[PDB]
Design a protein around this ligand. Structure first.
Ligand SMILES: NC(=O)c1ccc[n+]([C@@H]2O[C@H](COP(=O)([O-])OP(=O)(O)OC[C@H]3O[C@@H](n4cnc5c(N)ncnc54)[C@H](OP(=O)(O)O)[C@@H]3O)[C@@H](O)[C@H]2O)c1
Ligand SMILES: NC(=O)c1ccc[n+]([C@@H]2O[C@H](COP(=O)([O-])OP(=O)(O)OC[C@H]3O[C@@H](n4cnc5c(N)ncnc54)[C@H](OP(=O)(O)O)[C@@H]3O)[C@@H](O)[C@H]2O)c1
Ligand SMILES: NC(=O)c1ccc[n+]([C@@H]2O[C@H](COP(=O)([O-])OP(=O)(O)OC[C@H]3O[C@@H](n4cnc5c(N)ncnc54)[C@H](OP(=O)(O)O)[C@@H]3O)[C@@H](O)[C@H]2O)c1
Ligand SMILES: NC(=O)c1ccc[n+]([C@@H]2O[C@H](COP(=O)([O-])OP(=O)(O)OC[C@H]3O[C@@H](n4cnc5c(N)ncnc54)[C@H](OP(=O)(O)O)[C@@H]3O)[C@@H](O)[C@H]2O)c1
Ligand code: NA
Ligand code: NA
Lengths: 396, 396, 397, 396
């Protein structure tokens, strides 16, 4: 009580409440502090089963409760991957109606036709700092020095982490006298948000010192130089890739398309071409798809991924082609940063969804990436197929 | 329990459970149906306080429980808007650590400096179908017909809704013989995803028929022609805008920069130029910012926005400029689809977060959009300011 | 005579002052020998030129030393089924690249034996977008609304500077923080309108600046070209909203014609176009979803005296090839093609002659020329994609 | 001569067969009179040329009728402080646009009185990226892996076609579904290498095609140019990975020099560049973050006989102008400039001479030429931004 009055007078801030009073009681006190400023009473945000101690330590600050996202599931989904095999039930958490229904319909169609073939094309997490040099001459010198002394930098970077490994620094961009070297790391099963930052920091300080020994003065302005590129849509991430680069594909027979999707192959090809290809092209889109972000989002929320990386998951191309036997349908997601350890996967409810996939813990990130790609193709196929049905009806 | 065995034998599917057994028990039954398949037992996802009846009807399918996202808050945040004025406490729901701390720090700095000036530059929700014509000759005629008969189409579109209002159809793109007309709507307080789809659907059927009376045969292939653009990063949304286009700004004095941000004005300008501008340019990014998606994401989850729309919230340019008095710091988000009614704002926990802002219900979407814009400025300032501190340290 | 040559070497007088002292014709011979001595090499060809050196120095070039010769060829016949261009044409093309004229010439013959190309000009406008600085976002929004409501007044001021130009819109009006970027849209008649819209837009900004000062809102234009034109740069605003002449050309070929003339199949043309022009350009994050636009635009632009730097804009566009029931549908879409038939480089003698061989020199011929440009591009694009589809078939078997 | 001209009008013989029947020079006089008759207009100027018509018909043109004359001027003096080009130069420029040569000439004189331009070649490579069709993504991954391991083998096959070309890498190797786009990276010596890399890549693709046939992996090249090269189109891959010559030029001006020669202040230059070249290009979603590159590239490309269409690629780049303590830092970065000093259009008499006026015709001179291009661009770009800042100051 005496505590609540000091916050209203702004004597103490809500952030030091965890040190004064217990963390669990600090949350009940911060919930009532806003209830009185806004003058409204809350009922639902109070209830949570998640551990408030580890949450305040690794996932949230100034906690007042928890928000509840409705959780559904789509399945069965037969996946023909290299790390994920068998029928799966994908948990999806969204507030949008018809979305889980869309994916669930696509899952059933795909499973009765042999399943999705999905492969992880690449796996890397990047961090591109911005380093200021005195002149372009020093920038050229810095680029050359980094290329020859890679092995030394690798040792310095890898000393910060037991799981991360530096595999390349390419490309190394130069704008005038500013250099953007793209550190490429293997992060194991983690997404590696903070891992690559710690490794890159020591590598930058090491690079900073060794050049000082040769009368070349440089200094790092920021470890995230917006060439990473993190939580933004960028061409470098469409071409060179980032996180897990995934491709999923299916071959459907004309009989299966008419039986389950109630349409024809050339109708799917036409919808995909006018919408996903030409439509995205003339509107200058980087997402030559229809549904990636929607499916990424629901699956990202359930498993505790970084919400902001849905930005990156929306890039990719959907290719649908008329074959002699039926259609070839594929989705290409060159930018999908995921992890099965750390971050939001430790949160209780999100931890459970990964376990329902068999994907919580080590040696399971690639398995998760193959599920992500397979779930996207199911939803994308369901939608393009539904649009092609309308394309056929209106065609007559 | 006799029911549980029929699901395993795939006699009945988990979607048919709601009509046979009560919806509340249908959730407990399929929750155990996935526990048996994956062979793991769940404790947390089972707990929810949200109404499962309205959720299955308007937000989710095949519900098995709920996911809990940690909910925090950042404040106080003084807003000098046209619809929002005074100090606010912004609820943020995220699984990322240090994020709520970042926004809260920027909120305090911003508040000790008179607050944020934010204005809504535009408010519109768009839908651009793909229409196939016989030839480019018919495509031009379709373009001309739509322009002259605009008022007629407007009435047809507005017949589906009392809140919606068609205000323009611009631009109208043509690629060969395919037409992409961008329907522009005023959605009031809603985001209007389905509102504009029903409205545009009736308008297209009307255009389709009226042109048939001239023996010009056209037909809509799909209502979302990937020129909308919805849930994808596109230039058309960066230029012509989509949803609410918001701009926020603050004028900080050199004394304030040194007192609260612990840096200098030229270091803020330099960081923003090398990172947010040049860095994003050479990597061919559409997000010339640092943090938009992260802040958008936390605020979108708490208030029941579409998670997938975080993609669109990541577009924008951050402008930081060294003035004689100090610095000018502004954020420009031309693409922010928000609403205060419908969709995910109906969910209990998210409904409460809006009420803690005074933003749930009618005549409050513009108020919410100004809060969105200001919170981004707060978080963006905190980050660039922290990076400029390190930019100063390493330079000496 | 030769003593001036020594004064140039001592840098007593500069090369731009030579035209007033000695005749322009002799002023060119002087500075040509001045560079010959500095570089220590003798020239024999660039000194030859039949173009008028007087009007060239006045309207097209500075510090003239001679002329560069681009080989000029032609492709035809090209049957065009347009609204302003009709009949068989012989298109003059100027390039230094081999096999280019041959490719277009082959496509011209194929296209003509199949009924010709249907081409329409989708739009015709020249744009200018200044950057205006305001004190705050509050002032910028007020500036945006003021421009929208007082359009007719702005229109009158702008149109007073010219007899042919006409301000038709100011859209969109972009705002970033406190800076405003309004896109002035003009109809330019037969000219490309580079300077025309600048003279008009310059006076319109002076008017807006004064009129807002009367309502206690202080603004000022930083530059008339705010890089939202977008001029001689590849930009999305030019792909969507268009700029210059927006042209679309198309042909309908029967499956038999494809086998007789293109020596391929319809599905193979569709496939090459999909893998190359669409998917290929997308994954590489290209704005040109085509194969040949720039090459053909370039050759045709040089022959007719257009702005070479606008080849940048002519490279944007999408090529659509679709397998139909009877054969294939092939179209090209060029949303950004700034061309003109009067002013600029169309005044130069040799380029003036290339326009007359098309019947396109002078007024009321820009739309005809824009329809010829579109037809020539489709001809070249089809030839190439068709040639590639033959190899796609061969290697597939 | 009368019976031949009549046979062309009757379409008895075609104009392309005239070179074999009658002499190359007279076939040109005949083709000129054939079109003069069809269009019914008489020509006087194009008939006048001095270039050798025999070698032109063999390597540069088809169906020649004469020549077009572009006015040729020069700008100077231009002091260049490069690695292969040093001292004052006089750059020949060929254009039909007024005021252009004056702009560059003004910038050349200003720059020379301030110590000259520092220009460096960041990279030199010519690329060709075919599109190759595979049966499935599984085979596409195998193709990618095979290409990487068997690089040395592919290198030998490609290098067997030329004594100057040397394949240095095949990176990146993009995969979209089941289509592979491997970017062959070549060193072209002094040539631009359009046909050099095409012949080399053709032999390498047939080699890859067969070597996989030995493993029962069936692939085939759809086209050698898969539109990921990227050739004569604006593409992000060329902005990031670069193509042709990647050039950066820069100058350091003192505040006194800016007021004496450019008639402005350093902060006016910085502001113009930020509002125009950076923010302006960003909101319009442009890839050219500059003001003048294309205009100067074009005039210099025409004079020296480069491929006209590559002006497209020369329009990419970022201009950086920054207020320093002594004055201003001004730089231009052109990541995509395909040029050559041997072959192609450099053999044409008039263009061959302009290169000789630079000392850049022949071997071991392409890098010298690329440094001239970069310095000339900076000269023109500075001239313009400096002139605009004069108006920016006046109106303020
Ligand atoms: O706390 C912060 C940690 O970062 P975070 O939790 O936010 O997420 P994060 O950035 O993705 O880092 C994950 C952390 O978990 C550890 N780890 C445990 N098992 C791992 C596995 N199988 N693969 C890769 N890393 C594994 C790593 O420690 P090491 O650095 O020792 O590898 C790494 O620091 C500091
Ligand atoms: O609605 C529920 C489902 O949500 P939803 O997906 O339709 O969300 P939505 O797509 O954003 O549409 C909003 C819905 O809410 C109604 N509405 C009531 N008051 C409103 C206001 N002040 N502003 C805007 N819309 C308002 C509209 O009815 P009207 O169509 O009659 O305007 C509209 O159907 C059922
Ligand atoms: O001098 C000339 C160079 O022109 P420029 O480089 O200045 O190109 P420009 O900037 O695009 O302007 C063309 C000029 O030519 C005039 N003009 C003459 N006939 C015309 C027509 N049919 N359509 C449109 N404009 C026409 C216009 O004068 P008005 O604006 O006074 O009509 C206009 O100022 C040779
Ligand atoms: C036919 O091709 P093109 O000449 O029209 O254009 P191109 O594709 O640029 O080829 C240039 C050709 O010129 C030859 N060459 C002579 N001197 C050279 C040098 N210093 N550097 C590179 N190449 C040189 C090469 O022949 P080789 O292939 O025989 O080396 C090369 O194939
Ligand atoms: Na504690
Ligand atoms: Na099957």
């Amino acid at each position: 009580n005496e505590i609540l009055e000091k916050l209203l007078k702004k004597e103490i801030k809500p952030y030091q409440l965890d040190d004064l009073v217990g963390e669990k009681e600090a949350i009940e006190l911060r919930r009532k502090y806003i209830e009185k400023i806004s003058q409204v009473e809350t009922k639902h945000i109070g209830h949570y089963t998640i551990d408030e101690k580890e949450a305040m330590k690794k996932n949230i600050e100034n906690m007042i409760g928890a928000v509840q996202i409705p959780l559904g599931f789509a399945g069965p989904l037969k996946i023909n991957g290299k790390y994920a095999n068998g029928e799966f039930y994908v948990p999806l958490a969204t507030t949008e109606g018809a979305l889980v229904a869309s994916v669930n319909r696509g899952c059933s169609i795909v499973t009765k036709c042999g399943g999705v073939t999905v492969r992880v094309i690449d796996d890397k997490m990047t961090r591109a700092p911005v380093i200021k040099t005195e002149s372009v001459i020093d920038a050229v010198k810095l680029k050359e020095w980094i290329k020859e002394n890679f092995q030394r930098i690798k040792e310095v970077a890898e000393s910060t982490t037991r799981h991360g490994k530096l595999i390349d620094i390419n490309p190394i961009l130069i704008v005038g006298r500013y250099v953007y070297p793209r550190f490429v790391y293997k992060t194991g099963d983690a997404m590696g948000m903070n891992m690559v930052t710690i490794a890159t920091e020591k590598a930058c300080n090491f690079i900073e010192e060794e050049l000082k020994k040769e009368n070349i003065n440089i200094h790092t302005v920021a470890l995230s130089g917006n060439a990473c590129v993190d939580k933004k849509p960028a061409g470098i991430n469409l071409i060179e890739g980032r996180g897990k680069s995934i491709i999923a594909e299916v071959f459907l027979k004309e009989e299966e398309i008419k039986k389950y999707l109630k349409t024809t192959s050339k109708a799917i090809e036409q919808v995909n071409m006018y919408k996903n290809l030409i439509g995205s092209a003339i509107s200058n889109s980087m997402g030559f798809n229809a549904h990636y972000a929607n499916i990424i989002g629901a699956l990202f929320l359930a498993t505790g991924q970084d919400e902001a990386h849905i930005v990156e998951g929306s890039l990719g191309i959907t290719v649908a082609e008329c074959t002699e036997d039926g259609v070839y349908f594929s989705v290409t997601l060159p930018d999908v940063p995921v992890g099965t350890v750390g971050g939001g996967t430790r949160v209780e409810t999100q931890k459970e969804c990964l376990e329902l996939l068999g994907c919580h813990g080590g040696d399971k990130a690639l398995k998760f990436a193959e599920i992500v790609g397979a779930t996207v193709l199911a939803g994308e196929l369901s939608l393009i197929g539904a649009l092609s049905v309308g394309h056929l009806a209106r065609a007559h």
